[PDB]
Symmetry: D2
Subunit: 331 residues, 4 copies
């Protein structure tokens, strides 16, 4: 007999389908940061990685596998073929090269819609009941694209949206007040990135509205310029790219937080991109961030935030812009 | 009054010392994986990052700070100046560029000795009571260098040594047996990397010695080629470099495990590099991996492993080689 | 030589002063639930237990020590003598038998002031720089007693106060809305227990004020009876005592959450009992719950919550009642 | 319209089922310590509690529910009816009053067999695919009883067995050597409690056999009395009962560790009670502890420990005694 058979007596071989499997598509800076965060939070019993660069993909898989002794995820797999992703509860899309210098949004949309045409049918083929979590940019457009190609119901297509924007805002608010970000509440909604909307009415510490205490909050005439907090969210994003060339840790940590609510059915509220048709005068098939309840069926509910006329106008303008790009797309 | 003063009443403004501070020196692939693993394990109340590339350093600091909402480390600081590292309990050295394309594994000696000449006195200036954890290669030589320059007692200079080698070995053992690496015990000692020693006598599952069950274990006569498990440790290290260009995740996870035992005073046993003079016929000031008890004073004790004649001869050969290089170094 | 000396070579026998020590005084239902919660959250490197019943104390210590394999707190000590508590960062008081049936508040305070007269000087003698966290009831009165006897500055004397009341409120709110309590914000302030104040203005989900949406919120004329969410906090407390005889798990978990902010210097905001003199027209030396910023120096700051005239009147009435009892105390 | 419908827009109201449910049967000292440990380890998405004392059951459920804000288990349910336990992955039996002073092993068996006659069919009815984890005493006899009544394959019927005995042994070993119990390996096998077997050959630190270093280990020729390390396991168990009246924390922590390997499919090796028929000359349907690989299918494999003739004779004697009691049982 072999050493294995001499040491171990087998009662059964009968392997089951993975019970809490997560797949990450695209093992770049963002994808690997999502992967390490997910592993360190014990969210999955199986992690699958997919990319088109075979050597980098294998090397990343091996490097994570070599840390198994310090993890509680007994199976890490990878491949260019989507058969490695079979029976995933959650599939995270972080694919396509990051935006290049001088590269426009329309050019990013062009190439990423193209790869989604291959990615999404392959994901759906092997995990037809998965929740799709889109991170790739422009995240609001690509969440619509994933929804359209997949044919999945609204609840199972989630865009990262304004989750990173709100996390950055809460960090900046915390720094300003000398309070941990967990205790500094504030929501950044609408279109992810440059055109996002800070909801000044909800900015609070311990339920004490900062807008009620300081009526000039968020206005350009504010003597203390609290609008700086939202402006620094956009500025810090560009600054990080200027200084290191990409963002990985902050987006990876924010994605693992969404994955935790989904995998553990927590029903916590997060700012994520969802189908907002029928809200704020929006009539088009567009995905924008609102506070969503996240659980085992993805987005089961959304919070109906009271917005000012200015805030509503900004979301409607974003919806018009996004729909303008979307109507010209070919699926 | 400002909005901050309107919202918050201050009881005292007494600036106090960090209680569980960790510094990481060199924010490359290894340093940042050490950082994210330490942050995700809640080991520090303050993290300080140091490097010579100012833009990359600032970008890395900001990226980690932007994930604060999902962490429990309230302060992340960085700087080229070592004043940012003041009062660290643990200082991790992951500095110096990794081994370049046509560079000798040894070419790191001269250039890393030169950078350590400036790093170590600066670390000692601001944290004279810290534990020093050396990761930079050749890790055994550089741990000796850190010890010599710092003037610290033996217990406060720890080399990552064979911690990654043993973690890889236990992953490979686990794969062969169908058992989690946590339950697959085995020790790889001596010189980190190519010249490491697998201690076949200690390889076990549930206290059942694999060598007792299979006497050919670790021999060239073994029809099952169990010796290939240690050889695959060395081969997988080269394979990861070939596939992705560097190793980050596995070393980061292993370093956070050592940091946990130190910060929490666990007194767990780890294979790390320590001053081995007085053991295995070694008379020179050389650092090699043996199982060490790690706690709040660093290495308080070491395990005296019974080695075979061939194992002892390999450690003594490594000591002769390391000392040969070390005696020619100028301080 | 002994087996220990044959197996292990000692580098240094020097033991450092405790670095992250917590003491729990009174190992009853509350004390032990605080103890298990602190241990499972890896908050301390040393846990000390104190009581007057020597056998129960030793049994509780041993029972925790027997679970050491599954914990990361390497030292668990106990004793009737407070020398075991030396150099604690945090001392938690859960001493005195729980309130008996037919026993009045005045009876409860008299008893507990009599034991605090011995406890507090003993705690101060061995840990003069500790933070004191009072749990024993009436918690607001006993926090004042601990502050008076200790002579500590007000930032280092923290009462559990309305932390459990707010946790219960958020659980009930979450059940009604179908949202996790983490995403259901609401503050219960003032006097702990029967006379606590729900601050309806701060009750929100994702920054959306429930009071703004539903102006009858918290009024008796409310068709949806949202006021019952606070009334059920008080009813649920009496119900738990009626059904099992005491509360342990919920208070244990809430105390560990306060211990986490203190030990890790998080600066999160919690509803805890602090010296309220100078706020809400209160002129007496009374401790009431307001949102406090908790860190390594205890309460460094407090949030100035805007209260309605009714809310302010209730806190002032509680201050008058508490002071009325406090002025007659003899210690 | 309601406040809930004003605040939250529902996307779907699909009444879904838990993916990772655990049930605890018997909410006594052991049962509730298992529950709190399981909750603090984030192992379940739903926890069900069952008992026959309805008030105590409801009070325990409520007390856990009130701590929801500090947990990540969104649903805690209870009931006398087993419909609350439907589709549990793991069912833990901690039912039947603890053995009383002057109560014989036979009397404890008889009353617990009677209670299992009702419990086990009820558990099987609602969770036919669950893993059964028996804690109630005499644990080896009651694991056999559960297996007989359930009709489950032997991989899905696990007895707590020598898991607590080995945890206590490793604690005592760690105390003597000044090493954390995680780094002190040693296995206590066979019959749980008084008649358990310490496997001296497997006792090691870092793969260094204590028996090889100290040949008198486990004998009376031992001037250091290492045999007491096993004897003190039995003595400390009686001592804890003498001092506090029961054991809860250590058994609770040990059970949560088994639950973690099962729920997360870790395939770690644990000393648990399994059907040992066909091993060590044993021919009867008896359950004894050996090192078992634990995962999503329960016990998939067992480690074949090489025992000395004396060790083998002690296990066969335990099997004869257990079978002697079992053959007279009425189902
Ligand atoms: N939503 C947010 O808040 C947010 C924040 C930061 C970054 N991002 C986005 O995340 C995306 C990734 O960023 P990055 O820095 O990791 O880029 P990257 O260039 O480092 O990595 C991209 C990876 O995708 C892979 N890839 C390319 N085509 C593929 C395909 N057809 N199938 C599978 N994999 C493929 C690449 O090989 C590469 O490994 C970008 O779109 C970026 O804008 C989003
Ligand atoms: N001990 C082990 O098991 C193990 C395993 C893997 C890698 N390593 C070692 O870790 C080291 C780092 O590897 P890497 O891949 O992260 O290299 P890297 O090139 O990615 O990063 C090196 C960093 O050090 C910085 N640096 C250079 N000089 C400095 C100075 N004087 N002060 C502070 N910082 C300075 C660089 O700017 C750079 O950011 C290497 O020596 C490598 O061999 C050790
Ligand atoms: N602040 C809150 O929200 C909150 C919630 C629940 C309970 N509590 C309070 O916690 C306290 C303890 O409750 P319990 O149910 O654990 O009581 P308990 O009767 O179970 O235990 C009390 C313990 O205190 C010990 N003790 C008595 N005198 C002592 C002394 N001089 N020194 C040290 N220890 C001594 C007892 O021996 C006993 O072990 C009560 O006052 C109770 O009201 C507070
Ligand atoms: N395997 C081990 O290592 C180990 C260690 C310690 C204790 N134990 C055992 O755990 C068991 C429980 O101990 P305890 O101290 O918690 O006892 P306990 O008296 O505190 O609690 C027993 C509980 O079981 C309930 N119960 C009784 N009949 C029931 C039924 N038909 N259905 C459901 N629930 C029922 C009781 O109402 C009670 O709540 C004992 O058998 C004890 O010996 C085992
Ligand atoms: O933080 C990021 O990194 C990216 C970024 C940053 C500024 S605009 C987009 C990112 C990530 C990686 C690469 C690039 N390349 C890039 C950036 C700007 C250019 F003008 C051209 C190319 C960009 C991608 C992205 O969406 C974010 S989050 C973000 C971006 C803008 C404002 C607010 C937020 Cl919260
Ligand atoms: O796993 C690694 O990555 C490095 C490595 C890998 C193989 S030799 C050294 C590493 C890290 C980063 C860069 C490079 N560059 C490199 C490597 C080999 C060459 F021949 C030339 C250049 C190397 C550095 C290192 O020490 C390790 S751990 C390791 C190395 C060899 C055998 C066993 C182990 Cl456990
Ligand atoms: O939840 C508890 O348990 C206690 C309690 C519960 C209702 S009044 C006091 C508690 C704990 C232990 C024992 C007793 N004994 C008792 C209870 C009621 C009586 F009328 C007489 C004696 C009481 C002690 C206490 O402070 C709390 S928390 C609490 C209490 C009232 C309202 C709201 C909350 Cl959040
Ligand atoms: O640690 C325990 O507590 C119990 C125990 C302790 C000593 S014998 C049984 C236990 C738990 C709760 C109550 C009682 N009551 C009891 C105790 C002794 C008697 F003689 C009669 C009744 C017993 C139940 C039990 O199995 C254990 S573990 C254990 C028991 C004996 C030897 C070694 C171990 Cl590791």
């Amino acid at each position: 007999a072999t050493l294995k058979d001499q040491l171990i007596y087998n009662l059964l071989k009968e392997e089951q389908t993975p019970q809490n499997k997560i797949t990450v598509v695209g093992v770049g800076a963002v994808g690997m940061a999502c992967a390490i965060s997910i592993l360190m939070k014990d969210l999955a019993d199986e992690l699958a990685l997919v990319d088109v660069i075979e050597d980098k993909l294998k090397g990343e898989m091996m490097d994570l596998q070599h840390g198994s002794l310090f993890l509680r995820t007994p199976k890490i797999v990878s491949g260019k073929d989507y058969n490695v992703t079979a029976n995933s509860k959650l599939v995270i899309i972080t694919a396509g090269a990051r935006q290049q210098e001088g590269e426009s949004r329309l050019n990013l949309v062009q190439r990423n819609v193209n790869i989604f045409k291959f990615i999404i049918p392959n994901v759906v083929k092997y995990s037809p009941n998965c929740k799709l979590l889109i991170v790739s940019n422009p995240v609001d457009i690509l969440t619509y694209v994933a929804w359209k190609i997949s044919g999945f119901p609204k609840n199972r297509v989630i865009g990262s949206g304004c989750n990173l924007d709100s996390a950055r805002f809460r960090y900046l608010m915390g720094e300003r007040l000398g309070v941990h970000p967990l205790s500094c509440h504030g929501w950044v909604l609408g279109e992810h990135g440059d055109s996002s909307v800070p909801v000044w009415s909800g900015m609070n510490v311990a339920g004490v509205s900062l807008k009620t205490l300081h009526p000039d909050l968020g206005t350009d005439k504010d003597k203390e310029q609290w609008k700086e907090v939202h402006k620094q969210v956009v500025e810090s994003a560009y600054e990080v790219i200027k200084l290191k060339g990409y963002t990985s840790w902050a987006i990876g940590l924010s994605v693992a937080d969404l994955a935790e609510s989904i995998m553990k059915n927590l029903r916590r509220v997060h700012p994520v991109s969802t189908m907002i048709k029928g809200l704020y005068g929006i009539k088009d098939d567009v995905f924008l961030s609102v506070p969503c309840i996240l659980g085992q069926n993805g987005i089961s509910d959304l919070v109906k935030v009271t917005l000012t006329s200015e805030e509503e106008a900004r979301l409607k303008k974003s919806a018009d812009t996004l729909w303008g790009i979307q109507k010209e797309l070919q699926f």
